[PDB]
Amino acid sequence: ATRWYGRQPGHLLRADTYWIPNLVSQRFAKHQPAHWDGTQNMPIFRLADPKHKDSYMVQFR
Amino acid sequence: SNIFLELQDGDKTVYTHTSLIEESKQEQIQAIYDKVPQWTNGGRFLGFWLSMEAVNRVQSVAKLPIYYRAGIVATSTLLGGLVSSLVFWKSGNENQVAKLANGAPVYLKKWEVPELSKLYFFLDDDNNFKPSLNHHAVTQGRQYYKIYQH
Amino acid sequence: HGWTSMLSHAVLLLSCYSIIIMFLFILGMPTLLLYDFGIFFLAYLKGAGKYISSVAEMMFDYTACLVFYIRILAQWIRVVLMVVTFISLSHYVSDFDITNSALIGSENQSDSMNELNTNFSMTYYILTVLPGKFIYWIYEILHTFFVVC
Amino acid sequence: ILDYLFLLDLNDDLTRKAVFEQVIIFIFIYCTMNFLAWSTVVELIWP
Amino acid sequence: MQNTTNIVHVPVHMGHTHYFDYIDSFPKLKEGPTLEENHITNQKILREQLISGQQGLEQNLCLRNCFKLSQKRYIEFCLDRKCGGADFQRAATILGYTK
Amino acid sequence: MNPIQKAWLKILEPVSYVINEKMAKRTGIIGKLGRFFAIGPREYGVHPINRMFIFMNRKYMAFQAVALHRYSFVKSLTHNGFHMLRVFRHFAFVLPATVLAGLGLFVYWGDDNKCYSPDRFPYLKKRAGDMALPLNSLNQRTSAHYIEINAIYGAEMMKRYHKVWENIIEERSKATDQEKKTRYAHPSYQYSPLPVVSIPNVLNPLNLQ
Amino acid sequence: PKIVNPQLWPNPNKLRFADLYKYQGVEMKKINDSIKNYKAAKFYIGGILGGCLVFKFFIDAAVDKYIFGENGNGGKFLEMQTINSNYDYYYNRQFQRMRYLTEDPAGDDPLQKTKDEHLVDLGFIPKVFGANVEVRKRAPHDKYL
Amino acid sequence: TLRAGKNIEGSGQVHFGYHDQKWGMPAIPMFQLMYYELPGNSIVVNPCRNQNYRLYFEMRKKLGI
Ligand SMILES: CCCCCCCCCCCCCCCCCC(=O)OC[C@H](COP(=O)([O-])OCC(O)COP(=O)([O-])OC[C@@H](COC(=O)CCCCCCCCCCCCCCCCC)OC(=O)CCCCCCCCCCCCCCCCC)OC(=O)CCCCCCCCCCCCCCCCC
Ligand SMILES: CCCCCCCCCCCCCCCCCC(=O)OC[C@H](COP(=O)([O-])OCC(O)COP(=O)([O-])OC[C@@H](COC(=O)CCCCCCCCCCCCCCCCC)OC(=O)CCCCCCCCCCCCCCCCC)OC(=O)CCCCCCCCCCCCCCCCC
Ligand SMILES: CCCCCCCCCCCCCCCCCC(=O)OC[C@H](COP(=O)([O-])OCC(O)COP(=O)([O-])OC[C@@H](COC(=O)CCCCCCCCCCCCCCCCC)OC(=O)CCCCCCCCCCCCCCCCC)OC(=O)CCCCCCCCCCCCCCCCC
Ligand SMILES: CCCCCCCCCCCCCCCCCC(=O)OC[C@H](COP(=O)([O-])OCC[N+](C)(C)C)OC(=O)CCCCCCCCCCCCCCCCC
Ligand SMILES: COC1=C(OC)C(=O)C(C/C=C(\C)CC/C=C(\C)CC/C=C(\C)CC/C=C(\C)CC/C=C(\C)CC/C=C(\C)CC/C=C(/C)CCC=C(C)C)=C(C)C1=O
Numbered sequence: 001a002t003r004w005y006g007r008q009p010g011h012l013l014r015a016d017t018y019w020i021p022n023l024v025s026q027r028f029a030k031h032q033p034a035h036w037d038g039t040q041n042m043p044i045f046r047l048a049d050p051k052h053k054d055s056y057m058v059q060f061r
Numbered sequence: 062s063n064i065f066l067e068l069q070d071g072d073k074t075v076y077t078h079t080s081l082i083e084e085s086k087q088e089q090i091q092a093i094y095d096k097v098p099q100w101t102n103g104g105r106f107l108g109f110w111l112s113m114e115a116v117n118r119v120q121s122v123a124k125l126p127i128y129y130r131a132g133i134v135a136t137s138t139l140l141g142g143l144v145s146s147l148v149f150w151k152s153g154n155e156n157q158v159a160k161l162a163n164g165a166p167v168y169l170k171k172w173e174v175p176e177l178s179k180l181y182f183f184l185d186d187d188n189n190f191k192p193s194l195n196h197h198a199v200t201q202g203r204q205y206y207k208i209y210q211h
Numbered sequence: 212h213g214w215t216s217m218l219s220h221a222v223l224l225l226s227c228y229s230i231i232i233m234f235l236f237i238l239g240m241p242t243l244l245l246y247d248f249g250i251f252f253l254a255y256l257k258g259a260g261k262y263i264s265s266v267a268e269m270m271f272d273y274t275a276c277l278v279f280y281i282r283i284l285a286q287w288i289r290v291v292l293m294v295v296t297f298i299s300l301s302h303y304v305s306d307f308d309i310t311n312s313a314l315i316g317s318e319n320q321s322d323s324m325n326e327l328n329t330n331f332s333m334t335y336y337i338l339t340v341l342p343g344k345f346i347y348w349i350y351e352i353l354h355t356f357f358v359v360c
Numbered sequence: 361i362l363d364y365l366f367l368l369d370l371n372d373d374l375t376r377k378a379v380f381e382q383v384i385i386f387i388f389i390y391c392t393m394n395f396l397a398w399s400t401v402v403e404l405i406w407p
Numbered sequence: 408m409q410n411t412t413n414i415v416h417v418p419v420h421m422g423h424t425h426y427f428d429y430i431d432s433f434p435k436l437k438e439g440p441t442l443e444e445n446h447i448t449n450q451k452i453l454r455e456q457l458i459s460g461q462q463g464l465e466q467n468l469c470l471r472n473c474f475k476l477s478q479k480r481y482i483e484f485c486l487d488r489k490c491g492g493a494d495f496q497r498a499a500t501i502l503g504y505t506k
Numbered sequence: 507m508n509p510i511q512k513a514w515l516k517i518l519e520p521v522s523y524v525i526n527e528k529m530a531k532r533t534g535i536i537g538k539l540g541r542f543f544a545i546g547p548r549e550y551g552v553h554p555i556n557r558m559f560i561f562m563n564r565k566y567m568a569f570q571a572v573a574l575h576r577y578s579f580v581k582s583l584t585h586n587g588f589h590m591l592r593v594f595r596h597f598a599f600v601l602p603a604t605v606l607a608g609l610g611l612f613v614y615w616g617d618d619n620k621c622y623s624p625d626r627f628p629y630l631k632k633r634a635g636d637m638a639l640p641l642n643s644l645n646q647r648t649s650a651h652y653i654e655i656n657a658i659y660g661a662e663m664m665k666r667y668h669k670v671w672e673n674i675i676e677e678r679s680k681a682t683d684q685e686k687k688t689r690y691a692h693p694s695y696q697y698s699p700l701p702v703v704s705i706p707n708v709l710n711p712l713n714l715q
Numbered sequence: 716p717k718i719v720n721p722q723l724w725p726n727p728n729k730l731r732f733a734d735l736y737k738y739q740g741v742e743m744k745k746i747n748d749s750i751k752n753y754k755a756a757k758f759y760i761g762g763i764l765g766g767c768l769v770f771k772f773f774i775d776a777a778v779d780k781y782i783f784g785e786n787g788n789g790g791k792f793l794e795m796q797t798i799n800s801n802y803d804y805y806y807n808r809q810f811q812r813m814r815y816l817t818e819d820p821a822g823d824d825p826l827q828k829t830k831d832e833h834l835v836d837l838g839f840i841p842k843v844f845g846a847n848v849e850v851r852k853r854a855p856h857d858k859y860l
Numbered sequence: 861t862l863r864a865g866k867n868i869e870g871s872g873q874v875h876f877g878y879h880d881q882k883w884g885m886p887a888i889p890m891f892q893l894m895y896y897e898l899p900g901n902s903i904v905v906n907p908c909r910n911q912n913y914r915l916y917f918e919m920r921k922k923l924g925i
Contacts, residue, residue: 002864007413007814008860010627010642010903014798015378017386018221018896024231031377031796035446038184038192039858040908041645043807044797048641048903052810054803056422056429058898061882065786081454084447166458172786173921177450177457179788181914184858187503192449194456195464197471198915201922202464203457218389220899222892225393228386240593247591301890321876365777366791371622375795375907381620384607391608394601399569408820410879416816416852417809426894433809441801507739508746515716522719530721546718547739617901627903637863644905651912782913789917795907 009047012055019057062087064094065174068159068167068209075167077209080177086161093154100149101142108141109134159211166205175203234287241283245276296358300351308344466490470498507547518545573601672709679707812854 016022034044046054064079079087112134116122122130168174185193194203216222245252257275260268311317311324333339373380422431440448470493473485479495486493499505515522522545529540579598582589589595614620623629630643678686688697720726729736784790799807831841854860862868875881885891 003819004817005646006640006642007817008642008645009811009814010640010645011906013374013378013902013904015382016902017227017379017382018219018224018899020223020227020893023227026379026798029798031798033443034795034797034907035442036795036908036911037442037445037449037857038182040906041811041857041860042906042908043804043811044795044799044907045904047807047810048898049810049814051428051430053422053429053431053806056427057895059882059885059895060898080450081457083454084450174786175457176784176786176788177453178446179784179793179914179917180453180457181911181918182449182453184856186856190856190858192452194453195460195468199464199468202461204461205458208458215389216887218392219385221896222887223889224386225389226889227893228390236594236597239596243595244591244593247585247593298890301888305886305888305890319876361773361776361780363777363780363791365774366781368774369781370620371625372792372907372910373621374625374904375910381617381901384610384614384620387604387607388611391604391611394573394604395566395569398572398601399565402568402572410875412820414818414820415813416818417813419813430810430813433806433813436805436809438801438805442804507742512716515718519716526719526721531723541721541723544721621901625905627900631900641903644903783917787917787921789914793910793913795910 009049009052011043012046012048012058014045014054062091063176063178064090065171066158066162067171068162068211070167070207070209073169075169075206075209076171076174077162077165077167078174078176081165081175082162090158090161093158097146097149100145104145105138105142107145108137108139111141112137162209163211165209166207167209168206173206237283241280245279293359296355300355303348303351307348467501470502474499474502474504511548511551515545521545570605573605576602675707675709808857808860811857811860815854815860816852 015026034042036042046052049055050058050060062079066077066079068075068077079090082090116125116130116133122133180194181196182192182194183196184190185195212223212226215225218224221227248255253272253275256279257272260271262268311319311322317324370380418434419430420432420434422429439445469490470486473482473490476482476485483495486495486498490498496505525540526544526546529536530544531537532540576598577589579595581587582592582595582598617623617626617628625644627639627641627644630639631637681689683699683702684697688695691697727735781790782792797804834841870876873881885895885897
């Protein structure tokens with residue numbers, strides 16, 4: 001049960017200046033209003049998981 | 062479209078919000094409020110042009126201190142914008158938004174007017190997870206004043 | 212950049228910002244130079260026109276202003292060459308061979324120490340194969356030094 | 361009273377950009393670097 | 408057993424990239440309406456519920472609160488005491504719990 | 507010498523008389539103790555931290571004067587004062603803006619000063635005793651509304667149960683032993699009386715209300 | 716203040732040895748120069764603190780505007796934005812469903828569970844069931860992920 | 861992990877057995893451009909939490925506050 005609850009991914013901010021591709025690309029990104037759909041788990045950012053397509057450059061050790 | 066409307070319900074002055082109107086008519090209301098600055102700024106130009114033509118070519122105002130001449134152009138500039146804004150609304154637009162708000166709920170006080178985008182709701186499992194205002198913390202209801210008719 | 216290792220979560224943070232600063236302020240140098248020339252700026256680049264047609268000269272002036280910026284912007288391919296050459300050397304060194312056969316009293320018994328490990332390369336390994344890997348290493352760094360300098 | 365004062369917010373900066381918290385780190389590093397470099401140049405005219 | 412071992416019940420696709428390991432895509436992943444299209448959809452549902460779905464609401468909320476009790480005998484006591492003497496099966500049909 | 511050292515000397519004036527006048531000039535263990543703890547001005551009393559600030563303040567201030575004393579970018583735009591061709595005029599305010607940003611160097615130090623820390627993961631590890639937590643610990647949470655509302659609800663309903671509890675005890679006191687044992691009893695139970703004993707009827711064993 | 720002297724040794728003559736008595740004075744002289752700066756900075760620092768006192772009242776009205784809004788229904792505090800595209804959002808939702816359907820092997824330790832041999836000796840002979848081979852695990856609604 | 865109920869023999873993360881190891885990031889620019897350590901301050905509470913304040917604004921208007 002503990003391992004299963006731990007795999008439900010946490011929310012990790014998209015804003016990142018540590019990776020040089022995001023440091024350049026995010027200067028041209030447009031922040032759009034994320035309309036609330038009635039939930040408490042809207043993944044409007046990236047997810048704190050090593051296998052996520054926007055978090056693979058992060059070292060989860 | 063976040064606009065608070067002040068409608069004339071006979072003798073009462075009722076209030077509502079554009080979020081309480083269907084999206085098909087919110088676009089027509091927003092289009093009217095978008096042409097107000099075009100009439101306001103356009104009227105400011107005429108008030109600035111006609112005033113500059115009078116304080117220079119009319120040799121009765123030209124023989125005056127510059128501070129008096131600049132005050133006329135300054136006064137006629139913003140006065141030309143306030144007049145054009147009145148002609149815009151009073152012609153057919155102040156009554157068009159009233160007709161576009163037909164069927165929307167109104168309230169006696171502005172403080173009682175809710176914004177539909179700011180209301181709390183939940184996904185009702187008992188109704189195919191549709192969004193519902195009748196969440197498990199609601200006690201009585203909304204009970205607006207009346208439906209606007211124009 | 213060694214002295215900035217603990218200043219943030221990225222060791223190369225200052226370097227990644229500096230390459231952006233270096234690109235933007237170098238890009239603005241030709242722009243500010245054309246502003247200093249004034250409205251005659253096209254005469255400073257190409258010189259005197261040849262045809263009476265302003266539309267014809269407009270095309271030649273559009274090229275001179277483009278060439279004026281290409282002389283600067285195309286030089287960043289040199290920086291790309293220096294980075295690629297530096298990465299290829301780092302890839303060769305990071306993947307260079309190191310095994311338990313070079314360790315003194317190894318305890319990594321599960322890392323091929325107790326397994327039958329034959330190969331299909333040339334024999335006399337330290338005389339033929341190992342010097343060959345070092346010869347290519349010297350080429351990688353000598354080619355890198357020549358490029359980056 | 362105006363909405364321009366909303367720029368003073370850092371409690372809910374993650375709702376809009378969350379970029380301020382990382383850029384100032386570089387600026388503080390950049391000031392430290394220029395401090396070490398510029399003080400060396402201007403002071404070392406004395407020998 | 409390997410400490411990093413997971414069993415997944417839905418298909419995933421891994422990236423074929425050097426130095427990185429991640430899930431780059433999900434097979435047959437369809438994109439629904441945007442966050443703005445869903446918002447407009449929900450506003451239309453909430454607007455009709457605000458204008459035409461507020462009369463007789465106090466009675467239905469009492470029936471719903473009574474049916475969240477643990478035991479059935481407490482539900483019948485709640486309906487009789489708080490809901491003006493409503494019937495169990497009759498209120499269950501109103502709320503939509505009857506098959 | 508500083509005023510704080512002078513303030514110590516006024517308070518230690520009687521102590522200075524016991525050690526320096528009496529104990530210091532004696533012999534033996536009392537003499538060695540007095541000469542060792544003699545009171546006066548400090549040998550090696552300099553404060554290196556205070557001196558470290560004065561040095562770094564003067565060195566960093568000379569850098570501020572260089573970085574802030576720049577020729578204006580605005581004045582060089584007209585080509586009429588001191589600057590005709592300045593191809594790097596757009597760098598003129600980078601050093602001043604960088605120095606002015608250094609004023610918040612200590613105001614915004616670390617993660618907690620740049621955001622609302624209770625909404626970040628490291629705050630949870632600190633409240634758990636500097637203990638590692640799973641990365642999704644900020645999500646698996648019970649409603650703070652429930653914890654506080656239920657705490658009030660339970661205590662408010664306990665006051666209303668206490669009033670009902672008194673009416674039940676009083677009504678059961680006036681009930682026959684036959685009634686208090688057959689009511690709420692199992693249907694299969696046949697009542698048989700017990701010998702009458704004297705057992706007091708105490709509401710609260712401790713003398714509480 | 717006067718310092719008690721044990722008189723264990725005679726101090727050098729001030730006229731013959733003047734350098735030995737100077738450090739104390741120049742040290743307090745430095746502090747006096749710093750106090751002149753502290754006093755002269757009273758109006759500059761006070762003007763800033765006075766500005767903060769006036770700025771406090773505008774920040775109060777801006778916070779209530781930020782939180783409550785125009786008509787007390789909520790201001791820009793309720794706004795949240797994102798740079799995720801529509802594909803990025805539905806990838807994250809499916810990533811949430813995938814982790815919900817991500818289990819580990821072998822479950823828990825069977826030796827920490829009630830034995831069937833113990834139930835027989837306690838008076839309850841358990842019935843053996845077959846494996847439910849027809850059920851398919853699925854993710855719940857997004858509100859529960 | 862020990863408090864969570866998993867006894868630990870040995871120590872460290874240099875797994876002797878059949879496990880994947882994760883060495884420290886090589887302190888060379890190649891790996892320092894591809895990777896960066898996980899900043900714990902970037903793991904946040906979802907902003908949908910702020911939408912619960914909608915209940916407060918509605919309760920205040922119902923109570924005439
Ligand atoms: C997606 C982004 C896209 C854009 C990105 C790039 C951004 C560009 C921004 C760069 C900087 C712009 C700022 C300009 C500053 C201007 C300030 C100023 O006004 O000073 C005046 C100044 C000229 O004054 P001067 O040179 O100092 O001296 C003047 C002499 O004394 C005067 O001698 P004279 O008296 O002999 O001259 C005669 C007269 C003669 O002029 C004429 O030719 C006359 C024309 C005919 C008029 C019509 C006549 C009609 C007649 C009808 C007759 C009717 C009557 C008929 C009969 C009726 C009978 C009743 O000429 C003039 O004096 C006029 C010159 C002034 C023209 C101003 C030109 C600038 C306009 C820029 C427009 C856009 C600005 C946007 C900026 C926004 C911020 C980015 O203007 C300039 O200096 C211009 C400099 C521009 C250089 C910068 C170029 C940068 C490169 C850009 C392109 C890059 C391409 C490659 C890109 C590659 C990828 C990166
Ligand atoms: C009446 C007549 C009476 C006598 C009758 C008989 C006369 C003699 C007939 C001889 C019959 C054949 C002998 C069979 C017995 C072999 C026993 C043995 O130990 O073999 C082991 C040896 C290693 O084989 P293995 O261990 O069994 O491994 C099996 C596979 O090879 C493994 O395959 P793998 O691919 O894995 O292996 C890689 C391959 C590596 O790839 C190679 O094959 C290397 C090839 C590159 C070198 C090629 C150029 C060599 C010539 C350079 C000098 C040219 C001078 C003229 C230039 C003219 C230019 C136009 O092999 C190696 O790893 C070789 C490393 C071992 C040797 C390296 C160091 C040698 C010492 C060098 C310094 C010597 C200082 C001289 C001191 C004198 C006293 C000792 O076998 C051979 O190397 C065969 C060599 C055959 C002779 C070569 C000609 C030498 C000429 C020297 C010229 C300077 C002196 C001139 C004197 C003139 C006198 C008239
Ligand atoms: C109600 C209250 C009572 C009211 C009445 C009483 C008040 C009356 C006035 C009292 C005094 C006011 C002071 C100013 C007037 C003084 C008059 C004068 O003659 O002074 C000359 C004075 C004499 O020079 P100086 O004494 O030797 O040295 C002056 C400074 O030490 C340093 O001088 P500097 O020249 O070296 O400084 C240069 C710096 C000065 O700093 C700035 O002004 C900041 C400028 C940043 C904005 C640049 C905008 C670029 C164009 C954007 C166009 C669209 C705009 C849309 C905006 C939307 C906003 C969301 O600007 C730059 O760094 C320029 C380079 C920028 C980097 C490159 C950016 C452009 C390329 C990137 C383009 C990206 C887009 C490309 C594609 C576009 C799409 C096609 O120079 C000055 O200008 C003094 C200004 C210094 C700041 C004073 C601040 C005092 C505090 C007041 C609060 C802040 C007010 C200002 C806020 C402005 C908004 C940020
Ligand atoms: C809504 C936005 C658009 C507003 C209108 C367009 C205005 C221009 C866009 C705004 C630009 C602001 C940012 C840049 C600021 C300027 C930077 C700069 O380099 O300037 C230095 C320049 C210096 O020019 P200089 O000529 O003195 O010296 C430069 C010499 N060279 C070029 C060789 C270096 O000064 C300026 O301000 C020029 C820009 C003037 C723009 C004025 C536009 C209106 C003109 C007056 C109104 C005329 C109406 C008719 C009058 C009738 C008779 C009375
Ligand atoms: C403005 O321009 C600028 C300069 O000027 C040119 C700079 O020099 C500089 C450079 C900055 C420096 C050289 C300073 C560097 C200082 C750094 C890095 C940190 C300094 C930290 C310390 C000195 C540690 C101090 C330790 C403490 C405060 C903790 C122990 C003290 C305690 C508990 C006292 C309790 C505090 C109070 C009661 C507050 C009241 C204040 C008082 C003064 C009361 C004192 C009371 C008594 C009885 C002495 C910058 C950046 C700048 O922008």
